[PDB]
Amino acid sequence: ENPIHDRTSDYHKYLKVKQGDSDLFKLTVSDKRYIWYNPDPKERDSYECGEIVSETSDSFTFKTVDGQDRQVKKDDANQRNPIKFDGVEDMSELSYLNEPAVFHNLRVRYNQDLIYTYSGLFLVAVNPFKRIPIYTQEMVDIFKGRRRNEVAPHIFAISDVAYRSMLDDRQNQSLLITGESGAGKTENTKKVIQYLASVAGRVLEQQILQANPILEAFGNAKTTRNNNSSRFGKFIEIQFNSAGFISGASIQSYLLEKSRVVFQSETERNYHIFYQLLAGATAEEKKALHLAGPESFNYLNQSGCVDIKGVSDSEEFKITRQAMDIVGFSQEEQMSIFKIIAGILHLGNIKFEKGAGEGAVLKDKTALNAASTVFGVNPSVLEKALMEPRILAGRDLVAQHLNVEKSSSSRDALVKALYGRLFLWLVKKINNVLCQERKAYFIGVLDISGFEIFKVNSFEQLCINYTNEKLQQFFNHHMFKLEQEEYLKEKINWTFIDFGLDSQATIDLIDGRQPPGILALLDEQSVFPNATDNTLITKLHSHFSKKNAKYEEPRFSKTEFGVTHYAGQVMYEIQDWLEKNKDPLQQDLELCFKDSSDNVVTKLFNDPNIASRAKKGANFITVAAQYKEQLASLMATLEGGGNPHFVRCIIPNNKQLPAKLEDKVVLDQLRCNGVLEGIRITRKGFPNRIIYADFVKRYNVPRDAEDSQKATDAVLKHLNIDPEQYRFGITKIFFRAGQLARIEEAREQR
Ligand SMILES: OC[C@H]1O[C@H](O)[C@H](O)[C@@H](O)[C@@H]1O
Ligand SMILES: [Mg+2]
């Protein structure tokens, strides 16, 4: 009748704790007390359960699994919770809050394939690495309209709360999904969009859903940490009208890792689309675009990996096209896109060799010709733009003759420019389909590239990790600093707590303007004509080595520097940072391609939104300077809207495998995310607070008395409730954890 109360239901099967049996009940009513302890003290995250057998005034004595006795100061003891709590849906409710206790609860739920658990006001999501049947339309219909208490933890539930808050307060909402690479941010992002598309839907809705398949084909790739890594960040606005139904959507993408098109580490892959087309193209297309297998192209055959376990690139290519068909990309538009993808691969097979002099020559023109043909440009113009670009020397026109290395770098620069502009064009084309009505409100979903560490971390990794560092500070800001400052404002005689979670020092080291940080010193070096990679790291060491605690000059290298992030220390290799920040492209290469006969290619080099570049003084804006501002604008939106809804995505292990929840990996993320601290603030504080005059409004009789703090003093007193669970502020009635949601449902039943 109602699937929630029906133990036969799929909702009870896949989203509720299984019923315990008679044997477990006898354990549950037992009076024995237990403790989480470390059998091996060096391994501080590995725990066993031990029974407390005696206690002194200041310590517990307990029995290990093997039978030996041990003591522990009660101040240092991690008590196990009464097992009745095992599986609790909100860990606010736990009696003992400690790392082994919190981890254990998630383990119990994970083992039953319950990946969602609440931690007070935010949702925790552990990556299952297997399909779970909790995202059907049936499950959507169940969560539709239900308040957070009534239903089990689900991404739908927090999406619904954000949707109801948008309309109850007439304010834009932010759903921010944190996590390191592979933790599940993109999967959950898509579930949020699925839910709101049906709950407030009315082909627009089909098209919204088809956008992300397109961008994942061109923006996602296999890394060592995730087989479907997002190599670009995205803020997605879901837009609604004043009535509350979907009006449209816009996507704001950030920092495509276009360097991946020309280089990939061992075991990795280029962007999916390359493998999709060559695998799934018709015989006409393969000849039209001079295609081959991935082993035939240098951009696809140097990593040693061309396929992903459990993925058919031939089938994904069918999926990719259908999404383009539904969104409205024409047949010749799509063919122009594939011509570009094809041309990039051919450009990469060009082999520059040494000529009679140091200047480079091109003895085989088979790749250049195939590229020129598909792009629709003059091969000899292109050839001369690659190896003989014209520059100005003062005002004089002088033709370079580049060597093999610099000819190869310019060709790479062209390839990364073509791919990044194609990606920006896809986003823009899509936004114009999905945005045809002035919004009334929106819910903005943030899905960034998550924290990652590799053997070699470069400029791209610092920008990625810096963004992850800023979102964590945003979480710290709202849960700890803003929460308490509202308490202080209302004079509830709360004395401040230091939760020891501040990412700001690391943030300032990266992006401070004065004292100038890494990104400022980078910019300075990028416009100085005698600068090199080694004058840059020398400058970074002098400013920060042994002067900033978040910075390390390593003793084992002369090209690496270490940044201590919330998620751990990262060591960055400085090679090529100047060129990556400047993002140069020979103008002769640009001139060649604006004469292209392909209408998509000509748009990528003539549309000023895609092709032109902002000047900050005498030079072009750098990549660092632009992105920093792009992100600052995004942060302004998030802080300007309603309070953010947080989903902390958690990776169970580093092997991308199901049913292996590892203790060290999980507790690392729980500590640096500030989960336990986020629980503590909810328990020790007053999360639910209400304006006096309208508490009576929603629930000597109650309503519109001259002053309601006098009234509610009476309402609560006459009523059956303790006065430690509320506090009288200047303008609000603060409530302790749970009181409001606990009580008013008796008002819902009365
Ligand atoms: O929350 C109380 C419920 O009943 C009433 O109809 C309210 O107006 C509506 O907001 C909700 O459906
Ligand atoms: Mg992702």
Author numbering: 1 to 202, 210 to 706, 712 to 762
Paper's wording?
Replacing the two W-loop residues by three glycines in M765GGG was expected to affect loop flexibility more drastically than with the double-alanine mutant construct M765AA. We crystallized the motor domains of the mutant myosins M765AA and M765GGG in complex with ADP∙VO32− and solved the atomic structures of the proteins to a resolution of 2.60 Å and 2.55 Å, respectively. The superimposed structures reveal that the mutants crystallized in the pre-power-stroke state adopting the same overall conformation as previously reported for the wildtype. Characteristic features of this pre-power-stroke state are the partially open actin-binding cleft, the up position of the converter, and the relay helix in a bent conformation. Only minor structural deviations from the wild-type conformation can be observed for the mutants concerning the β3, β5, and β7 strands of the central transducer, which are slightly shifted, as well as the relay helix conformation. The high resemblance of the wild-type and mutant structures, which are representative for the actin-detached conformation of myosin just prior to Pi release, and actin-rebinding suggest that the mutations have no or only a minor impact on ATP turnover if actin is absent, consistent with our hypothesis that the W-helix primarily mediates the communication between active site elements and the actin-binding region.
The ATP-driven mutual interplay between myosin and actin drives muscle contraction and many other forms of cellular motility, including cytokinesis and directional cargo transport; yet, our molecular understanding of how these two cytoskeletal proteins communicate with each to generate force still remains incomplete. With the aid of mutant analyses based on kinetic investigations and simulations, we identified the W-helix as an important hub coupling the structural changes of switch elements during ATP hydrolysis to temporally controlled interactions with actin that are passed to the central transducer and converter. A critical role in controlling the sequence of events associated with force production appears to be played by the W-helix, which we propose to act as kind of communication zone in the inner myosin core for coupling conformational rearrangements upon nucleotide binding to cleft closure-induced β-sheet distortions by putting a stress on β1 to β3 of the central transducer; this is important to temporally couple weak-to-strong actin-binding transitions to the initiation of the power stroke and release of hydrolysis products. To gain mechanistic insights into the proposed role of the W-helix/transducer region in mediating actin binding to product release, we followed a mutational approach and replaced the two hotspot threonines in the W-loop of the myosin-2 motor domain from D. discoideum by either two alanines (AA) or three glycines (GGG) in order to reduce the rigidity of that region during weak-to-strong transition without dramatically disturbing the fold of the protein.
